[PDB]
Write a protein that binds this ligand. Structure first.
Ligand SMILES: COC(=O)N(C)Cc1c(C(=O)O)n(Cc2cccc3ccc(F)cc23)c2ccccc12
Ligand SMILES: [Zn+2]
Length: 224
């Protein structure tokens, strides 16, 4: 998170830290618990082995609040496209259910035709980089404003407002950045978006997946 603050410890108990391994090496992402057995994140966070930590604030130290669960299944959207970064959404089936408590519980999703309009203020949280090269051990957060479609259409050739949200005022040094991928955009306590991508500079606007567009695929997947 660029330009943010340390979160109040355990104030966002839906937050998941992902440690990802594949032949391509090690990666880090965020994610969020949407049911006792499922975490939602981005498809570009896929790996052959993913371990999830819930209940964390400082993910570099042991805390008896943490729950460590390997993902039994990593289900990318069937039309996820690496090249355009379209349909950037993935469900993790946990190998066991979490023990729900003050520090570990799910977050609500939007309704289908509810919407999210320019000018809405939201929060994004994660363990990602705070500048170009430096990181953090502890969860951080920042408030970002929803931008108009054209502000992303102008700078991102493959942007589609049917499936993506445009986020962050270029006037402020405030953004989700590397390490924050997969984490939630919370608006009025609901997870409307998923951190997807942006410019290497970290200067907004940036691109989130629009959850409302994938609700059918989400529901069908979790039901089966
Ligand atoms: C297996 O996992 C991985 O390979 N990864 C997690 C690496 C990866 C990241 C990442 O480091 O988070 N991002 C997000 C991203 C990258 C660059 C600029 C950004 C600016 C703003 C922003 F909010 C996000 C940005 C990706 C996007 C697409 C593909 C891969 C990645
Ligand atoms: Zn604590």
């Amino acid at each position: 998170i660029i330009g943010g603050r340390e979160s109040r410890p355990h104030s966002r108990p839906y937050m998941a830290y992902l440690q990802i391994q594949s032949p391509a090496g090690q990666s880090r992402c965020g994610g969020f618990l949407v049911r006792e057995d499922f975490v939602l994140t981005a498809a570009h966070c896929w790996g052959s082995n993913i371990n999830v930590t819930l209940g964390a604030h400082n993910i570099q130290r042991r805390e008896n609040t943490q729950q460590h669960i390997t993902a039994r299944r990593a289900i990318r959207h069937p039309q996820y496209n690496q090249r355009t970064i379209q349909n950037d959404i993935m469900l993790l089936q946990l190998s066991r259910r979490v023990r729900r408590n003050r520090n570990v519980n799910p977050v609500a999703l939007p309704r289908a035709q509810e919407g999210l309009r320019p000018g809405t203020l939201c929060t994004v949280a994660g363990w990602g980089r705070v500048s170009m090269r430096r990181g953090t051990d502890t969860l951080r957060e920042v408030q970002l404003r929803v931008q108009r479609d054209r502000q992303c259409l102008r700078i991102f050739g493959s942007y589609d407002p049917r499936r993506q949200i445009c986020v962050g005022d270029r006037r402020e040094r405030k953004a989700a950045f590397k390490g924050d991928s997969g984490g939630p955009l919370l608006c009025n306590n609901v997870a409307h978006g998923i951190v997807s991508y942006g410019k290497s500079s970290g200067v907004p606007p940036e691109v989130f997946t629009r959850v409302s567009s994938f609700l059918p695929w989400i529901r069908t997947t979790m039901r089966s």
